């Protein structure tokens, strides 16, 4: 496949005015108040990827919050919940019009416990991921050739499975409950951020 | 202490020409598709309360029904979760604009794990509640003295509650948080209704 | 509260010919192979009790197990599953027509938890239980007139609890759940006898 | 090796004039109000099988609901207290003549503790059912070849294990207790339907 | 209601000639090898007890010793397989004669899960037994009384639970436990007292 | 009792010239990075405390904070874990000179799993802290006199507490393990603050 | 790789005129009361064994028994709190001269907590050992060769074990642990399988 | 891999005139008071390891206890936690100058949770560990002194690798203040509170 390297920010958006766009992050760690965010992976669909490689200490990406931003455009993730916790925190701004595969996946897949990225391709796709240590130094100045085909085979077939997903939440008419889940889960992120992270906020207990 | 005891709806919406209603509900337990809806408690906010006897497979209530549905007015509810559910479940009408005290605690009062109505009263309005007749026969044709005081007593000051809460939203700035959170509990409620009350969607696992 | 005191058997069944007898036993623990019988307790339900102890090594009854054997007379207990299982383990004849308390309050008590005697005597008739001589000597040779007052007290109620929940079960229309469990009941119990008191049958896992 | 695919319904009784018929159902999940039944598996014992397509919303299917509701034959299920449930609420008829493997297993097989269909068949016959998942798109209209294999496997080995369980129950004399709990089975599923699926009904808590 | 307190020994065995003793310690802990032995308590079944205050560091404490060691005489503990395991520690001592009541309990008393002391004492007795810094150099009156009050009334126990073991056949069992408490201390001092050294896992 | 309360500071030090100090804090909640510091609370020892309402935004307290960072004067705290992580998260000062009674007490108290203030109080000294207020509104603009009076209870008593304990120490000649602790703990505090607040650094796992 | 396969009993004990003997047997479960005894295996310590069938209800293996009643020859089990108890539940015998592998292991193989026979012959002896339907009329070869090599290491694995105990000075505790270990089987067959006995709760 | 096996001690220490020295233990269990010291490896950093075989019931052992006691050299263990307890309790005297590996990996691999020797080396080092046994034998297998070796060749490069992580993300005096307070933490075990988190609140 295509990978396109960067340092810091898209330097423009040819390649991004579609209708969706695939995203996915990396980072050192679960809690985005100590560990920062070091890469970022962005898809039109196609077959090529951009991974954008973040600097410590990086306030700002213009042409990435350009996308960020624009509430024309969905913004596709598996488990949004931590990526938009951790994009919002890093560039301040939360995005607004998500679709999220494993919400989806949790209402559409009823018949499985395991909602995980790796199942949802074998099952879905036919295409076996090699999720052989995403553990790794994600901070190195220089990524090495198989961490950036790694970083990029995570958004490459997100598009296929929205689709997919789509015809799924239709067959069982289940479209509004995932449209107010996902109109939701940008403020499940900023609850994440505030200091709600380990409160389930509906639970009796 | 006027409590007005009514057979399947109100008679009129004469005393409830107003901009927020108190509303909680008495059933035979936690489970909507096995425990029928009994009885359903209202408010104005003033002294009195209005206690609804619902029939066993009674599907119409057209006053009460009225309220629920009208989006100008704003239902408050302790642990809403639960009696949006019950009131959809049993009405077809799911309320849309509500206010929860449960969420609301779980969004102020973060010094405490004790989020229950009881504690809650006693904290915020030094009134002490005398919770004993959650357990009873609730489908009796006759209510006692004693079970229509002690349901009425979970209303008259859910008002007073919300007036509190919101002056601490505002103050710790959680407004648009609590907003958000209050616009999805609907959905969150129809999602209980549709089979999934013991996920936690939002979670990881 | 006239309590008769027995040694052995029963003398005659002049006082039993009824449709229905309260039946509750007391050993030395939980493990039938371990901890004898010592007493057994029946009622008419006219409001008196007799209380038969039973000697160490004893395997007959005549009277008792004749009245425990006799399909024209639903025995009332609470908690069967443990009382059937002693009986027969002791004289040999397994009762086939039963009623248990507990399992109709957890058909039709919905709205709780508390399944005990204690907590249902009080609901259903606000009568208050004394549990306190549960951790006795009951093979002592002389029972204390404590003793003998609560053992009869564990029997004095179970009728009018039976009415009750014949009313609640034929209102709630589980009538014919109630009748197949207490139907299996026993074999439930023989199930205990034989190794499996610790498996759910009917489990998954 | 021949296995039959139809929609809606058998075309008719001929393949089954037979003293017992395996059964096996496959769904979109493990809760019958949510979950729609998909695809019924049934077996004569001989060499071939069954495989029906249920299309949503199917309310009737009369040849099969002949052969559900036949008291003559006994129905094999494996773990039928879900099969059962699932069956009545899709069609409305309870079978009430059944044998459960799982349930012989626990009261034959007690040198172990896993009692799955895989294991028993490997051990009881030396015969692999080794599948690829249980997990795949059920609902789909059309099914690959592999999922109609996958589907004709689980009952093509159940009248080989009813006949060896009937031998190991008649050899360890445990055959009056397997009985009682295959007459209970169907009530069990009830139960299930009704709202206890999560509650061991008799147990003390 | 006679305590007699002490420093470091009995001053001699005149009230100790006797078939059986009551025997209770009182320690910084539960653990032997951090928690020193503080109170030795000791009673002849007579209604009055001695109270033995150990100090820190004390390597001996003689004649004590010889009444522990002597197999004529039975050592009555509660929850033995603790004081057993502290009194070898500081002593070097094993005894190897004891009963324990709440082996015995728990072979007779299957009718419930409580097995203390208290609880024992009200089931069997009627009466009612309802930590602090035992390392004081001087022990209050409340400390005294209560040192005293957990050796009281052992022998009563020991009678009623022999008539228990004797009555439900099972002496023989009883007598094998007590026989191997003292070795189950001793696994307790050597490093096993988090592990049932029977069990499967 | 004399209990001066301030807001924003002390006026000065001329009462805590001292070579000891007892400090406590109240806060909203126990996660530093969302809930704020409401109440500072000192004591010289001599009988008289300090009751200082910290303002919401405030970020500096200079004679607070010149007595907070004086390697002088011993802070007392009771599990000063939280209070040194809050007051450095609030003010950007760590004191490095500490004491701690929950630490001393675990290292002393070798007789008890009940190392709360409440028991070492009524143990050590035979005095009664009626901690009923513990969970209160201590954002309120006006403190009421029952919260004034609680909040200065919990410092009158740690100089007592500190001289027993180290007489204790002494004794069991534990004093260079509990000095090593204590000048671990704010380090340990530290380690809260950055985001290992629920993880044992020196656990195995 | 001699096995001799018996119905009932020895024919008699010509191959077991030695000091100690391995023991194992086989059921249909862990739960005495409930799962028969179906096989018994025994071994003289030398290259064969000896797999004696048990019948449903058989009530008497005269040989057999006096073979397991001889104080003179040592009993060696792993895991012997089982076969004792459902030995002694057969043919009311328990024997009291008795040699545990699992017990010897949890006192000397302290670097682990794999104490499976499997990794105990792995690591002690590099050999690799590597249900079923134990009531069978006729059983298997591959039934047969099984329950011949659950008893063919044992000697090896206790001449093992007594130079660890001997090395480590636990020779004493080892030898109160297996007095004990009897009364153990007896008191899981009164009903006290679940419970530890000497625990606190 | 050049491995010296001694008895007793070290002959001399003219192999480690070093600034930091790769220290791992063998004992017959977790529990110091009942499992005695067995083997202490050593290395230098260079490709040479050294293994004391430690004989029953040895109280010294000075050349190696010199070593240990040198506050001018820094004794990197992994999980030095049991290991400094175990030394101590076997010859006296108790490191005050350590760096442990565990510790680090838990103030800087933040991305796993799995912080084992093995798994560091793989992920740091690509290196692969083939990871007990009766250590107290009195003569040790070749393959026992292979495994017990390969525990210390690595140490170092580890130690390297977390230095420059511990600067690249500003922990390093979070690090120094924990690898200081560590040896107190052993001792703490040692006295009994070896399953107690002294600084929980419960």
Redesign the interface.
């Known amino acids: 496949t295509e990978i396109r390297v960067h340092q810091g920010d898209l330097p423009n958006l040819d390649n991004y005015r579609i209708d969706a766009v695939a995203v996915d992050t990396e ?3 679960l ?1 985005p ?3 920062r965010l070091c890469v970022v992976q962005l898809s039109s669909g196609d077959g090529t990827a951009d991974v954008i490689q973040i600097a410590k200490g990086q306030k700002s990406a213009p042409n990435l919050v350009r996308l960020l931003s624009d509430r024309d455009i969905t913004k596709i993730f598996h ?1 949004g ?1 931590f990526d938009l916790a951790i994009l919002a925190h890093t560039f301040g701004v939360m995005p607004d019009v998500v679709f999220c595969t ?2 989806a996946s ?2 559409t ?4 416990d ?1 909602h995980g990225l790796k199942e949802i391709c074998g ?1 879905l796709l036919n295409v076996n991921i090699s999720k052989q ?1 995403q ?5 190195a100045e220089t990524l090495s050739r198989a961490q950036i085909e790694y970083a990029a085979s995570d958004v490459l077939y997100l598009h296929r499975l929205k689709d997919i997903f789509e015809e ?1 939440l239709k ?1 069982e008419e289940r479209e ?2 995932a449209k ?2 996902f ?3 940008p ?2 992120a ?2 994440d951020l ?3 992270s380990e ?6 207990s």
Chains 1, 2, 3, 4, 6 share one sequence.
């Open positions: 980072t050192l760690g809690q108040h100590r560990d488990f919940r494993k919400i949790k209402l897949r009823t018949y499985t395991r099952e240590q553990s790794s130094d994600w901070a799924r067959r509004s409950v107010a889940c109109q939701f889960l403020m499940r900023n609850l505030l200091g709600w409160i389930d906020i509906f639970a009796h």
